[PDB]
Amino acid sequence: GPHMATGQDRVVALVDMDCFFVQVEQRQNPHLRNKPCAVVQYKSWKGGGIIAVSYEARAFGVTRSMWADDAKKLCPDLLLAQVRESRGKANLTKYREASVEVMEIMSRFAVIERAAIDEAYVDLTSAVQERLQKLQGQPISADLLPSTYIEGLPQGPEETVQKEGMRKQGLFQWLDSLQIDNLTSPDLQLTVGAVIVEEMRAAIERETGFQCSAGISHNKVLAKLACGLNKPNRQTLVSHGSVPQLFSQMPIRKIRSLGGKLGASVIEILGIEYMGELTQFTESQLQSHFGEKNGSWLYAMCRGIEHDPVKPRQLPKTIGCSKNFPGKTALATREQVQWWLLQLAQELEERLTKDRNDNDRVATQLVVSIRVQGDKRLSSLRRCCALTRYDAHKMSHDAFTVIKNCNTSGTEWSPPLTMLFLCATKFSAS
DNA sequence: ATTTTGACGCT
Ligand SMILES: Nc1ncnc2c1ncn2[C@H]1C[C@H](O)[C@@H](COP(=O)(O)NP(=O)(O)OP(=O)(O)O)O1
Ligand SMILES: [Mg+2]
Ligand SMILES: [Mg+2]
Secondary structure, eight states, rough: OOTTOOOSSEEEEEETTTHHHHHHHHHHHHTTTTSEEEEEEEEETTTOOOEEEEHHTTTTTTTTTHHHHHHHHHHHHEEEEEEEEEEEEEEEEHHHHHHHHHHHTTTTTTEEEEEEETTTEEEEEEHHHHHHHHSSOOOOOOGGGGEEEEEEOSSSOOOSSHHHHHHHHHHHHHHOOOOTOOOOOEEEEEEEEEEHHHHHHHHHHHHSOOEEEEESSSSSHHHHHHHHOOSSSSSSOOHHHHHHHHHHTTTTGGGOOOSHHHHHHHHHHHHHBBBBEEEEEGGHHHHHHHHHHHHHHHHHEEEEEEEEOOOBBOOOOOOOEEOOOOGGGSSSEHHHHHHHHHHHHHHOOOHHHHHHHHHHHEEEEEEEEEEEEESSSSSSSEEEEEEOOHHHHHHHHHHHHHHHGGOOOOOOOEEEEEEEEEEEEEEEEO
C-alpha cells in the first residue's frame, strides 16, 4: 500500500533511428528515397549480406541477414547501397559519423546513454520538472503531441478505422483524463516527457534529415519496448498503469535481456509464456531459479519496475575491428594471418587516432580474438597485450605474438582461422 | 557463407 514502490520516479526515453543505415544512404543518394531499399555488405557471395532494410522493402518480406540475391527474389525492384570496403573489409565509418550527428543533437536536451550505433536513452526527469515549472497548470494540447501514441488507448466506447483516427482518439482520452495541476503526477510527468521528445525528434529530423521512433516511460526497459510499438516515425508513451494489460500477452522474449537463453529458461522452468505471468511467483522463487540478481530484476520488471540508470556515456568505451573468413576462405598460412592482422590494425590505428584527437583519450589495452574452424562460439580465444603506441605495424606484430602459439603446426597455420578481431580497450584521459 | 560490431556478467 503506502510503502510499495511503483517505479514512477523517473522519466526515461529511448530514441531509435528508423532503418538507420538505409536513411544514411538515402540522404546521400536521393534516387533511393521512398523506395524499397537495403544496405548490403560485400557482393561476391550471393549478392552480399543485408544489414538494413527500408520499410517499403520490409513490406515484401526483406529482412536483415538475407542474402541480396534472395531478397531480390522477394522484391525484384529492390535497390541496394553497399557498405564502403577498405583494406579488404567492410568499413562502417559513414554510419558511425551519422550516429555522432544524432547523438550530439540529443545531448542538447539531456544526458544520454549511447546504447548502440542508432539509439540512446535519455533521462528527462529534470527537464520535465523544469518544463512543468515553466507552464504552471497550463493544459497540454494534443497539438504538442502530433506523433504520440498512448499505449492501451483508446478503450471503451468511421473515425475508428484509420490508424491516425485511433491515435488521436487514444491521445484525446489520455489528455482528457490528465490532472494538470499536480506537478508530482507520474502520468503528467510522462506526458511532458513526450512533449520534449517530440521536440527532440523534430530537431533530429530538421538538422539531419533522419527520422526516428521513441518510447517514453519510467525506465529503460519499458522505454525500449514502447519505442518498437509504433515504428516507424512515431513515439509511444507507456504509462505505469498500462503495464498489466500490456504484459498480459507480451511474450517474455520481447523484453530487453530476455531474448536469449535466460528468457528461454524462464519459459521452460516456470511453464509460462507472457511477462505478466511472472507476477505469480515470489521474489525468493525467482531468485532460486535464476539467481539473486536476475530473480530480483524479474520480480520488479514484471510489475513494470526497473532501476537501471541512464548512464552518462555518449561515446563507445571500446573501438574494435574484425573480419570473418568463412568456409574455404579460412586463413591457413602464417603470411595470410599476418597480412589480415595488419589490415585490421591499420583500420584500428586510423579510428584510434581520430578518437584521440576528437575525444581527448587514449586506449591502453589491445584485445586479440580469433575463431578456429568448427568452433561455433564467436570467440575461440582471447588474449590481451599493452597498447602503448598508435602504430598499426606494432599492433599487428603484437597481436601475432600473442596468438601465434595457437597454431598446432606450420609457414602453415592450423587449424584454419575463421575470424580475426582486434579491440582497443581501457581508455584513459589524454 | 551472417557480418561487424559493442556492453556487461561470471569466475
Ligand atoms: N545484426 C546486425 N549486424 C550488423 N549491423 C546491424 C545488425 N543489426 C542492426 N545493424 C545495423 C544496421 C541498422 O540500420 C543499425 C541499427 O539497428 P536497428 O535499430 O536494430 N535496425 P534499423 O535502424 O535499421 O531499423 P528499425 O527501424 O527497425 O530500427 O545497426
Ligand atoms: Mg533503428
Ligand atoms: Mg537500434
